[PDB]
Amino acid sequence: MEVNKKQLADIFGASIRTIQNWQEQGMPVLRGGGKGNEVLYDSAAVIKWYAERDAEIENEKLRREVEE
Amino acid sequence: MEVNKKQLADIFGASIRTIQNWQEQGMPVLRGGGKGNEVLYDSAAVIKWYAERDAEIENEKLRREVEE
Lengths: 68, 68
Hints:
The structure is a homodimer.
Chain A: E1 2-4, H1 5-11, H2 16-22, E2 40-42, H3 43-50
Antiparallel strand pairs in A: 1-2
Helix pairs in contact in A: 1-2
Organism (chains A, B): Escherichia phage lambda
Subcellular location (chains A, B): Host cytoplasm
Binding site for ATP (chains A, B): 31-36
């Protein structure tokens, strides 16, 4: 699947900002989005790469008042 | 995101047949599906759970073409 930052951040329930931080973390984004573009995201290659290290990002929403 | 059995397999670029193995492996599908309702798949919860255990799935192309 090739989703956009919004669909990617949505498919992962993450924050597109996290997607903006992912594109800079070495994430396998579909297009290059390095020339005034928006860069797409291999929804599947995006996880194989997000599941092997971005499994903590989901915590972005798990840092409110769930304990401290 | 709440994708369906198809988009879901697309989320991980997997094969819906794998999604059929996820719904029985302990995957967090959106609704229970009432077996005939519309079991969906929390594209984001479906990964945090697939990234922590479905990281083998993609291995199919590995053990299959092992001999090649």
